[PDB]
Design a protein around this ligand. Sequence first.
Ligand SMILES: OC[C@H]1O[C@@H](O)[C@H](O)[C@@H](O)[C@H]1O
Ligand SMILES: [Ca+2]
Ligand code: NA
Length: 307
Amino acid sequence: KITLGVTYYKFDDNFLAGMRNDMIQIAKEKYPNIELLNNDSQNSQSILNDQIEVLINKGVNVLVINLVDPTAGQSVIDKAKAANIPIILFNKDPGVDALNSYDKAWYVGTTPKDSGILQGQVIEKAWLANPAYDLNGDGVIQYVMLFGEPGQPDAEARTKYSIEYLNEKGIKTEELHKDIANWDAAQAKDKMDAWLSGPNANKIEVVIANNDGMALGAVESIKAVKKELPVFGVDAIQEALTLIEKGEMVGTVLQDATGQARAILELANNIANGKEPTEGTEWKLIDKAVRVPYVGVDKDNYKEFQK
Ligand SMILES: OC[C@H]1O[C@@H](O)[C@H](O)[C@@H](O)[C@H]1O
Ligand SMILES: [Ca+2]
Ligand code: NA
């Protein structure tokens, strides 16, 4: 058999929970010779470090690692190298220097700039179609920004490029608030409650979140005070598609969890068997990474992605 030691920074992360289910299913359906050892790092890099050691000692064929601390890539790769076991990092990108430090390191993820641009496009379309969104009539989008995880490039890229896209198309924006909620619905709900209970809550026209999980929390907060505000996320998790169906979210951006899970399995299968990681697959490694594209989602196409 081939054994993959797979770690997830925490099990309640919505997007990664979907990917974990996908990987389990694909492995069962297509790879009878692969065994998955799944690990929950409890949002602790120290727990992850110990888990990596356990998996090394158990002699897994490939380490498949999701960083807890998004800056800890070099240390994790160093452990794999010292153990002489190949490593595929996923979802939290350790950067090129770290990947280049080990001949048996690879990465599967995305180019989050592209998701920021798509989110901007989704917002632009909805904004233009709904003049009522512009509550103060100034032509400017007064927004709040729910930022994900500091140091995880998906967060800064979605924050930067969504707004830059809008401005590039001649749509003025004004940031009323921006705060960190770490991909988490409950944290986002708390932040949104603070914003909606503030003296100037009325100024908010658009809610932008770096992921769907935080958008879910924002929606709970908005519903409680009986307001109607357009909310945008990223991932197209099923819960968000349902909110779009219900008219409680306006848009998101599909992040392809199934494709990422498939890439991890296909690359790991090759790596474990002395084959070039992309052999017999659709994937291209650019600077040792697979970058799986995103898709913009709104009321007009969300049905295509429901399961
Ligand atoms: O690093 C974990 C995060 O990764 C992002 O790509 C995703 O949009 C978030 O929902 C969360 O899963
Ligand atoms: Ca306005
Ligand atoms: Na992990």
